[PDB]
Design a protein around this ligand. Structure first.
Ligand SMILES: CCCCCCCCCCCCCCCCCC(=O)OC[C@H](COP(=O)([O-])OCC(O)COP(=O)([O-])OC[C@@H](COC(=O)CCCCCCCCCCCCCCCCC)OC(=O)CCCCCCCCCCCCCCCCC)OC(=O)CCCCCCCCCCCCCCCCC
Ligand SMILES: CCCCCCCCCCCCCCCCCC(=O)OC[C@H](COP(=O)([O-])OCC(O)COP(=O)([O-])OC[C@@H](COC(=O)CCCCCCCCCCCCCCCCC)OC(=O)CCCCCCCCCCCCCCCCC)OC(=O)CCCCCCCCCCCCCCCCC
Ligand SMILES: CCCCCCCCCCCCCCCCCC(=O)OC[C@H](COP(=O)([O-])OCC(O)COP(=O)([O-])OC[C@@H](COC(=O)CCCCCCCCCCCCCCCCC)OC(=O)CCCCCCCCCCCCCCCCC)OC(=O)CCCCCCCCCCCCCCCCC
Ligand SMILES: CCCCCCCCCCCCCCCCCC(=O)OC[C@H](COP(=O)([O-])OCC(O)COP(=O)([O-])OC[C@@H](COC(=O)CCCCCCCCCCCCCCCCC)OC(=O)CCCCCCCCCCCCCCCCC)OC(=O)CCCCCCCCCCCCCCCCC
Ligand SMILES: CCCCCCCCCCCCCCCCCC(=O)OC[C@H](COP(=O)([O-])OCC[N+](C)(C)C)OC(=O)CCCCCCCCCCCCCCCCC
Ligand SMILES: CCCCCCCCCCCCCCCCCC(=O)OC[C@H](COP(=O)([O-])OCC[N+](C)(C)C)OC(=O)CCCCCCCCCCCCCCCCC
Ligand SMILES: CCCCCCCCCCCCCCCCCC(=O)OC[C@H](COP(=O)(O)OCCN)OC(=O)CCCCCCCCCCCCCCCCC
Ligand SMILES: CCCCCCCCCCCCCCCCCC(=O)OC[C@H](COP(=O)(O)OCCN)OC(=O)CCCCCCCCCCCCCCCCC
Lengths: 57, 35, 106, 96, 206, 318, 346, 243
């Protein structure tokens, strides 16, 4: 289990807010490190369909 | 304490505290240290 | 990703270093927050090049009134609940260690 | 050999292959795919001249959309379900 | 060393993708390993381009890297933990050593019993009702109407009810509609419920 | 319960033989690939044992099936040795059914609603199954060797191309007819265990669920699931030992782990792999036994009910 | 006597209870022929409508990819008129109508027949709501598991035909139609070509059928108070319930179908092993244990919702119309409702 | 499913892999603009380029067709109350749907009113533009966007206008017409959105027409010739007439 506070339960100061934001962004990047980018996902979704009848335009 | 001797019967007065097959009392039955 | 100019950051906070300004720009903050964080870090002596973990959330080097530079570490805290507090000894956010005895030595 | 320090072929588990799993034609199709995965790009047949229609020679702006999307994508691949569009769309439902 | 225990050599070991990069057998107890740090060149370039007018960053073009599986919880070592917790009776002094390694750390074990834990409501209710036949042995059985004039006329009253329905008064009551039509027919020695009655036929007397 | 039986109509010996042969033929034809996969999994796991941990502990039958199909032989590759398997199964069924029916007729109770206790029925069934397995051991040996050929190295393969061809090769190359009865004791033990560990649990759970939920149609199949599971639990170690003995090649150098008997094979298995090693391919064995029992029971019940209705029994007597 | 296991037949004495209703009584209309006929009818109609809708939508997208999308009502009308006359649209309509016939007959009909077989006997409470609905959960689960793999062979055949149509002449089988492809594939590639790696389709079908049939049957009785006490429109309430059921089915089914994109279509990291090792089951487990739902819910509507949900909605409506969700309700204090009439008025 | 072969799927996979391997986060752009004059930046290191009060200059209350939409609510309420058509209970109750849906388009229009840029600044380096807007409720939203993500539209707003040769500034420097620009990726309130269109009203002063045009056309501005003016005239949460 991972704590949601990341060690900063309270943002009593803007410095604490900045530290939490930095570490949260780093953690999100690490978690998202294993999935494709927005462009790749969008193109795959758009051109998923491959079932046509007549070809050779 | 089965087929493996971990405790020391020398330092244990009675070896019957736990089930086992590898311990024997140093002062066995009928043994009486007498001055 | 709209990184602010490191030269502008240095100008706004004269005493900050180019490497620190560049690292702050790389950090994903809006330019205003980048400038404010640079100001705070320079003024406090906090080392921005520190990866926050569950042991310490930040570190700083400060020259005390006796002229000696000392290191001050900001511990990870909890909200009135030691049970929720993560007792660990690694630079890891994950709560890996589970202790049957909270106070080992009483 | 009896000793398990080093592997021996006596414990090898690999079934011999005698023919393509799904046929010679399937094997040929797989080879063609490997050779020309990107170089062969078939397209569906569509008429090239329609009176009423206007050819799509450029990307259209967002003002041409009949519907407004609610979800969105972060540039790092994350999928946002909570967006300002959702915030404004939830007002009528919550009110009712 | 035994190759049978090595996934790389032994192909019969099914590697778990969700545990890639995590080896519970290598944990420290207390854990003192750093497996996370600053990561760049994924979306945020490590180099400097703030003042480069000829370079514009496109975060959309994020190259795909290796999946980072969530850390796996530590797994118990049966022999090591048993030896660690073992204490000699009248030989060991009652005290806690200075070293922190003596702390009793909790480690996950076999997951089989948790299947029974998850199925406990079903198992508990089955034991309460089906195993004990609570409230009675007939509540959970498929219901069958009593046979014709069974066990006795005073309780069943099938023939008398049939005669009443076939009588003038029964027909008049059915016409009034306050009483519903007859639901069974007395065949040659047996009672058969009409399909619209929505009930099973009486069980055979054997 | 001692008078809960309803044996108001008993098929003749010829009818029993014919119906059993046909139904077992179709059941074996339907469920042979599962047994093939189970045997291949046992062979591949022989000498190594289960090395995965927790939920992965075991060998994946789907993985084995996919690997076998990838060889390029299609679904026909899963029926290799099917002729030998069918011949052996038919001979075993014929002998066992004949002996069991003879003994049952000799020692049946007079009353139609009384039947032999489960203990006596199990004793008779075990004796019949042991005799049949001892008589028909060579067919099972040939079938198992043909199945294991693919898994084993080509130099260790036997290259049998039929039941008769395998029998002749074993008799000539290995020398003597005694070579045809290798693993006969293990086969007899497996047959006895399977005969005694199926009829009991089925009736147990069937009667219990009848008492709980009364008379329904899912009771028979739930009892079938329970009986198949417990029969697999009881019999799988013996099947594994029989497979190991059959796969043991004559040449010790060819053999990866030579065995001298049933006890020696059990000792070697325990030494080189935990007691869990006896239950490799448990899912495949359970699926095979459940499908076989289900199809056999379904067809037999349908035909028997039709015959009883033709005879003129009452609804409850059927 | 016949083989190792003996199916012992036993006789039992009479037993009866006070109440003969609200339990399990097989409906007279629940027969192998009748249930199969109704299920086949409903499934065929729903599949035809669904496949026509999908063909129309896909042809509209194909035309729009080359021509600008409509700007007003007149432009939309002419766009539809030109779509209807496309040769590609007509061929797709024909082939997908054949596919609709096949699948509605062999998968949706099978699902409806099995559900009716396993759930026809669950009676309801007179002047009340059917409690103890948990008894129906095992039945619906059994039906879903039994009928889950009935569509994978047809779907794989359809995919094989559409992918064959896009190969050069030399490497093209030359299937005349979907039926011809379905008849030829089993003998050319083998039966296992239509079942290999079928986990995504099987789990998708299981979730669809279960969470659709069970949820609709539950709601149509539990929310009935709207029209039984509130005097609301019964047909409108049933339509809303069917819409909710189909939406829930799509939501619960799409994530499992997403495994196709992650395993095959996602770019592979050079020099590293596949994240999921090419196992759809492992990918599905990763989806199940993933923290963020949106990551695998991306593309829910552009990909699967408008290809699945309308068919399920129509299937539910047609099943309700024919009577595949009709239970028998009889008064518990009536003549056949109970065996103790002395306390029904006293 | 993978054993089934489809050339379209193979092409899609190849295209995805080729894109991933070829196009990197870092990109090379030659669209650099060097302003003739020296840029005087504020004390905050920013130069103001656009200013307007869209809420002040726009119609909020009496707007067509929202007045038409909302004028029908009394008609539906009266119809429900008096049942002039002699409808059934459910049929008459169906007339009460319109009052609950009539005001949605006005809400959407009021929301859109907050996408008109109120203030626009260019940061140091000529690569970041800060856009500040407000909602009709007074909430203030500021967002930073990279210059390359801008795409101007035609005067008709129905197409993308040519970035190189776009005629939307009069000779003196003001806008000929209300300009529209689509931002490919906009980060609003820490949430990224795709293809968001924003507007610069014609009734709005344009400072530094060269810089404004460069940002609109997406050129990266070269800020080498710069001076810093230390003027602390703007306070936090400063009042304005855009209310
Ligand atoms: C037993 C009963 C049975 C009854 C009969 C059943 C018969 C079968 C019916 C089958 C229906 C099939 C529908 C398939 C549609 C496929 C769409 C699709 O693929 O979309 C992909 C789309 C992504 O596409 P994309 O390519 O990425 O888009 C990119 C473009 O940039 C962005 O897109 P764009 O801006 O370029 O869009 C172009 C535009 C195409 O261009 C146009 O719009 C031009 C045409 C303009 C005229 C508009 C219609 C005029 C009036 C006629 C209405 C006929 C509708 C018939 C269908 C009804 C059922 C759907 O295309 C669309 O957006 C879709 C147009 C479809 C019409 C939508 C409006 C319908 C209003 C209905 C009013 C009531 C009518 C009553 C009729 C009487 C009888 C019932 O993603 C989605 O799927 C999103 C769809 C979201 C729709 C819902 C939005 C509101 C949600 C709020 C909640 C409301 C519902 C509450 C719950 C209710 C239930 C409990
Ligand atoms: C055939 C069954 C048929 C079906 C029916 C079954 C009915 C079961 C009961 C249903 C309700 C509870 C179900 C909970 C199951 C999950 C337990 C669990 O969390 O996993 C173990 C988990 C250990 O794993 P972990 O926490 O994930 O990580 C540590 C690693 O395991 C590493 O741990 P380690 O390093 O410490 O190594 C040892 C580890 C290695 O071994 C294992 O993990 C093996 C698998 C677990 C076996 C669990 C039971 C073993 C036998 C216990 C017998 C009593 C002690 C005598 C000595 C036994 C020596 C074997 O073993 C354990 O930790 C096992 C400790 C169990 C202690 C039991 C006594 C606790 C006091 C009783 C409180 C509950 C009262 C309930 C009744 C109330 C009536 C008014 O231990 C616990 O969390 C402790 C739970 C203790 C209470 C629940 C289990 C005991 C239930 C006793 C029977 C109650 C019957 C009442 C109804 C019928 C009456 C006739
Ligand atoms: C420590 C254990 C604790 C208990 C747990 C148990 C766990 C066990 C496994 C794990 C441990 C490792 C194993 C240790 C086993 C220890 C016991 C032992 O010694 O057993 C070995 C014993 C033998 O093992 P083995 O050394 O491998 O011997 C087998 C050879 O592999 C066989 O070689 P083959 O397969 O090549 O055979 C070829 C066939 C070659 O064929 C021949 O025999 C050729 C010569 C005769 C030909 C003629 C046959 C008849 C036909 C002609 C008739 C006349 C003509 C008729 C008219 C003409 C037409 C035919 O040979 C045979 O027939 C078999 C060999 C004997 C032949 C010599 C003559 C015997 C005459 C008597 C029998 C007659 C009937 C036999 C057939 C069956 C009935 C149908 O195995 C067992 O007993 C099996 C396991 C134990 C079963 C009993 C269960 C006890 C446990 C109860 C539950 C306990 C729970 C509480 C815990 C208690 C803890 C203490
Ligand atoms: C009715 C029972 C109701 C019970 C209700 C219970 C309710 C409570 C519990 C609910 C949850 C239960 C979950 C069960 C465990 C699932 C575990 C899992 O996810 O992993 C399994 C397995 C994972 O394997 P893997 O190693 O990870 O491989 C991954 C590949 O993606 C996929 O693996 P693959 O590609 O290697 O394997 C695909 C599989 C595909 O197989 C199929 O499509 C056949 C259906 C069963 C497949 C189940 C998987 C294989 C299991 C072992 C062998 C099964 C034998 C057949 C079924 C009976 C025994 C179970 O192919 C084969 O194994 C060979 C197929 C043979 C070739 C085609 C010829 C078929 C026979 C034609 C002639 C006879 C029939 C017609 C003529 C009749 C006479 C006139 O995944 C699946 O195959 C699908 C699992 C889906 C789970 C969701 C729930 C649906 C479950 C449906 C299964 C039952 C279908 C209906 C047949 C049985 C009743 C009649
Ligand atoms: C240290 C180890 C020493 C080992 C050697 C010495 C000890 C040997 C001990 C053997 C024990 C055998 C137990 C059998 C199982 C009994 C289970 C039981 O009683 O369950 C209750 C039930 C009771 O059944 P029931 O008939 O009373 O009715 C059940 C229904 N109710 C409860 C309603 C009455 O018994 C069974 O189900 C038994 C089924 C199996 C019966 C057959 C057993 C094996 C017979 C083998 C015969 C010979 C075969 C050929 C051999 C060839 C080689 C020689
Ligand atoms: C308790 C008193 C008795 C005396 C003292 C105890 C001595 C005996 C101790 C035995 C311990 C258990 C040994 C088996 C362990 C199996 C572990 C396992 O599941 O492995 C993975 C195997 C793997 O099988 P697989 O190869 O099919 O793999 C499928 C699994 N995946 C998909 C993950 C690969 O799983 C199973 O086989 C599951 C069922 C196990 C059933 C074990 C039954 C043991 C019975 C032994 C005695 C005989 C029965 C007697 C009672 C009934 C009849 C009367
Ligand atoms: C939170 C959990 C509890 C949820 C509520 C459950 C309430 C009822 C108690 C059930 C407990 C077990 C779970 C079973 C759920 C599904 C089956 C069910 O509920 O059975 C009800 C139904 C018959 O009931 P019905 O006749 O409709 O009742 C009114 C009659 N006038 O029967 C059927 O539909 C037939 C079902 C046959 C299969 C049932 C298998 C149950 C197994 C339970 C575990 C048994 C454990 C035994 C352990 C023994 C150890 C030695
Ligand atoms: C059932 C009670 C137990 C269940 C939990 C109850 C929680 C209550 C929380 C408060 C909010 C919900 C409204 C109250 C419950 C539902 C209405 C009800 O109890 O039924 C009675 C009500 C009025 O009927 P009444 O006038 O008393 O009948 C006399 C006839 N001579 O009849 C009506 O007027 C019908 C109104 C139905 C509204 C249902 C809304 C909740 C269901 C989920 C959302 C459904 C959305 C779609 C509805 C479509 C309707 C066409």
């Amino acid at each position: 289990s991972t704590s949601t506070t990341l060690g900063l339960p309270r943002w009593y100061k803007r410095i604490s807010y900045y530290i939490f934001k930095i570490r949260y962004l780093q953690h999100t990047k690490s978690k998202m490190n294993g999935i494709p980018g927005s462009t790749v996902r969008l193109m795959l979704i758009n051109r998923h369909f491959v079932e046509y009848e007549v070809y050779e335009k | 304490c089965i087929y493996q001797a971990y405790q020391n019967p020398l330092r244990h007065i009675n070896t019957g505290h736990n089930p086992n097959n590898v311990y024997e009392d140093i002062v066995m039955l009928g043994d009486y240290p007498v001055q | 990703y709209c990184q602010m100019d490191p030269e502008e950051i240095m100008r706004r906070v004269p005493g900050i270093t180019r490497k620190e300004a560049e690292f702050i720009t790389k950090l994903g903050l809006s330019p205003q927050e980048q400038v404010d964080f640079a100001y705070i870090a320079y003024n406090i002596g906090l080392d921005i090049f520190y990866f926050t973990n569950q042991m310490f959330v930040a570190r700083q080097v400060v020259t005390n009134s006796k002229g000696e530079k000392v290191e001050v570490l900001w511990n990870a805290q909890c909200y009135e609940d030691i049970a929720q507090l993560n007792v660990g000894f690694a630079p890891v956010l994950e709560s890996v260690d589970y202790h049957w005895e909270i106070f080992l030595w009483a | 050999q009896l000793d398990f320090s080093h592997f021996d072929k006596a414990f090898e588990n690999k079934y011999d292959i005698v023919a393509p799993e799904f046929g010679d034609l399937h094997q040929k199709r797989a080879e063609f795919i490997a050779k020309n995965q990107g170089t062969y790009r078939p397209v569906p047949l569509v008429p090239n001249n329609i009176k009423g229609l206007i050819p799509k020679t450029c990307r259209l702006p967002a003002t041409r959309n009949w519907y407004r999307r609610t979800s969105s994508f972060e540039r790092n691949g994350f999928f946002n379900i909570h967006t300002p569009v959702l915030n404004t769309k939830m007002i009528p439902w919550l009110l009712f | 060393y035994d190759w049978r225990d090595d996934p790389k050599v032994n192909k019969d070991i099914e590697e778990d993708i969700r545990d890639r990069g995590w080896h519970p057998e290598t944990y420290d107890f207390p854990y003192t390993k750093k497996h996370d740090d600053w990561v760049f060149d994924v979306t945020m370039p490590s180099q400097n381009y703030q003042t480069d007018l000829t370079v514009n960053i496109h975060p959309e073009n994020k190259k795909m890297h290796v999946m980072k599986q969530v850390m796996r919880q530590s797994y118990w070592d049966a022999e090591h933990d048993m030896a660690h917790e073992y204490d000699y009776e009248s030989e060991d002094l009652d005290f806690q050593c200075e070293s922190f390694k003596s702390q009793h750390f909790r480690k996950k074990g076999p997951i089989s019993q948790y299947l029974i834990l998850g199925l406990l409501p079903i198992l508990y209710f089955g034991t309460e009702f089906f195993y004990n036949h609570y409230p009675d042995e007939d509540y959970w059985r498929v219901a069958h109407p009593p046979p014709l004039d069974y066990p006795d006329t005073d309780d069943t009253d099938d023939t008398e009810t049939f005669k009443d329905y076939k009588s003038f008064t029964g027909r008049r009551m059915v016409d009034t509609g306050i009483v519903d039509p007859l639901w069974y027919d007395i065949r040659e020695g047996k009672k058969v419920y009409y399909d619209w009655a929505g009930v099973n036929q009486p069980m055979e007397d054997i | 319960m001692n008078y809960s039986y309803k044996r108001y109509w008993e098929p003749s010996t010829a009818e029993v033989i014919g119906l059993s042969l046909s139904v077992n033929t179709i059941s074996a034809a339907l469920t042979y690939p599962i047994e093939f996969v189970k045997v291949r999994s046992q062979i591949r796991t022989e000498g190594v044992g289960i090395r995965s941990k927790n939920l992965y502990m075991g060998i994946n039958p789907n993985k084995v099936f996919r690997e076998i199909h990838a060889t390029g032989n299609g679904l026909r590759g899963f029926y290799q040795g099917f002729e030998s398997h069918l011949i052996g199964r038919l001979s075993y069924l014929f002998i066992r059914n004949l002996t069991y029916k003879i003994i049952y007729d000799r020692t049946k109770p007079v009353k139609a609603h009384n039947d032999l206790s489960h203990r006596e029925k199990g004793v008779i069934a075990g004796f019949a199954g042991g005799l049949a397995a001892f008589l028909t051991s060579p067919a099972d040996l040939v079938n198992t060797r043909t199945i294991a050929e693919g898994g084993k190295p080509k130099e260790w393969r036997w290259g049998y191309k039929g039941l008769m061809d395998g029998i002749n090769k074993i008799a000539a190359t290995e020398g003597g007819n005694a070579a045809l009865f290798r693993g006969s004791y293990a086969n007899v033990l497996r047959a006895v265990i399977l005969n005694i560990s199926l009829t009991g649990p089925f009736d147990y759970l069937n009667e219990k669920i009848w008492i709980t939920f009364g008379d329904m149609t899912w009771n028979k199949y739930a009892a079938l699931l329970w009986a198949s599971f417990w029969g697999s639990v009881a019999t799988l170690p013996f099947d594994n030992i029989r497979t190991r003995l059959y796969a043991q090649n004559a040449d010790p150098t060819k053999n990866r782990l030579t065995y001298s008997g049933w006890a020696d094979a059990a000792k070697k298995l325990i030494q080189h792999e935990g007691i869990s090693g006896f239950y490799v391919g448990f899912y495949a064995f359970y699926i095979r036994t459940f499908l076989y029992a289900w199809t056999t029971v379904f067809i037999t019940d349908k035909i028997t009910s039709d015959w009883k209705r033709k005879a003129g029994l009452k609804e409850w007597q059927i | 006597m016949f083989f190792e296991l003996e199916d012992i037949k036993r006789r039992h004495s009479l037993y009866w209870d006070i109440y003969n209703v609200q339990g399990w009584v097989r409906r007279p209309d629940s027969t192998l022929y009748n249930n199969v006929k109704r299920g086949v009818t409903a499934g065929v109609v729903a599949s035809l409508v669904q496949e026509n809708i999908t063909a129309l939508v896909e042809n509209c997208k194909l035309l729009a990819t080359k021509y600008e999308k409509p700007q007003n009502l007149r432009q939309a009308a002419t766009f539809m008129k030109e779509v209807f006359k496309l040769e590609n649209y007509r061929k797709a309509v024909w082939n997908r109508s054949q596919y609709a016939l096949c699948i509605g007959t062999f998968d949706i009909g099978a699902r409806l027949a099995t559900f009716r077989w396993l759930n026809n006997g669950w009676q309801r409470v007179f002047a009340g709501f059917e409690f103890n609905f948990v008894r129906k959960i095992p039945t619906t689960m059994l039906a879903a598991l039994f009928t889950a793999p009935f569509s994978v062979p047809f779907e794989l055949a359809r995919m094989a035909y559409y992918g064959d149509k896009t190969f050069p002449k030399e490497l093209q089988r030359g299937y005349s139609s979907y039926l011809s492809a379905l008849a030829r594939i089993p003998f050319e590639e083998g039966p296992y070509f239509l079942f290999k790696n079928s986990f995504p389709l099987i789990i998708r079908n299981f979730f669809q059928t279960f969470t659709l049939f069970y949820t609709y049957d539950f709601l149509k009785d539990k929310a009935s108070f709207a029209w039984r006490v509130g005097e609301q429109n019964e047909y409108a309430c049933k339509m809303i319930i069917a819409g909710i059921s189909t939406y829930l089915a799509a939501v619960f089914s799409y994530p499992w179908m997403v495994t196709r994109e992650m395993v095959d279509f996602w770019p592979k990291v050079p020099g590293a092993p596949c994240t999921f090792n090419g196992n759809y089951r492992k990918a599905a487990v990763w989806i199940w244990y993933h923290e963020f739902s949106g990551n695998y819910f991306a593309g829910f509507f552009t990909k699967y919702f408008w290809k699945a949900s309308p068919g399920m909605f129509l299937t539910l409506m047609l099943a309700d119309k024919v009577g595949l969700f009709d239970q028998t309700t009889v008064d518990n204090f009536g003549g056949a409702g109970n065996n103790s009439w002395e306390d029904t008025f006293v | 499913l993978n054993h089934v072969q489809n050339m379209l799927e193979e092409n899609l996979k190849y295209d995805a892999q080729k894109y991933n391997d070829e196009v990197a986060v870092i990109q090379k752009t030659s669209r650099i603009y060097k302003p003739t004059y020296t840029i005087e930046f504020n004390r905050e290191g920013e130069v103001l380029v656009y200013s307007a009060d869209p809420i002040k200059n726009s119609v909020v209350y009496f707007k067509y067709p929202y007045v038409l939409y909302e004028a029908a609510i009394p008609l539906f309420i009266w119809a429900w109350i008096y049942n002039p058509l002699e409808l059934s209970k459910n049929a008459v109750n169906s007339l009460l749907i319109y009052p609950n849906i009539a005001w949605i388009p006005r809400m959407w229009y009021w929301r859109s009113l907050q996408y008109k840029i109120q203030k626009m600044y260019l940061l140091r380096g000529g690569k970041v533009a800060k856009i500040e807007t407000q909602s009709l409720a007074g909430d203030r939203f500021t967002s930073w966007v990279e210059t390359y993500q801008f795409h101007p539209l035609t005067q008709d707003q129905k197409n993308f206008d040519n970035q190189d040769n776009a005629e939307f500034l009069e000779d003196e420097g003001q806008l000929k017409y209300e300009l529209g620009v689509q931002l490919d990726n906009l980060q609003e309130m820490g949430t990224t959105s795709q293809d968001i269109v924003i507007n610069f009203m014609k009734e709005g002063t344009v400072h530094h027409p060269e810089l404004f045009e460069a940002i609109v056309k997406g050129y990266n501005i070269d800020t080498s010739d710069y001076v810093i003016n230390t003027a602390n005239n703007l306070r936090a949460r400063e009042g304005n007439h855009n209310h």
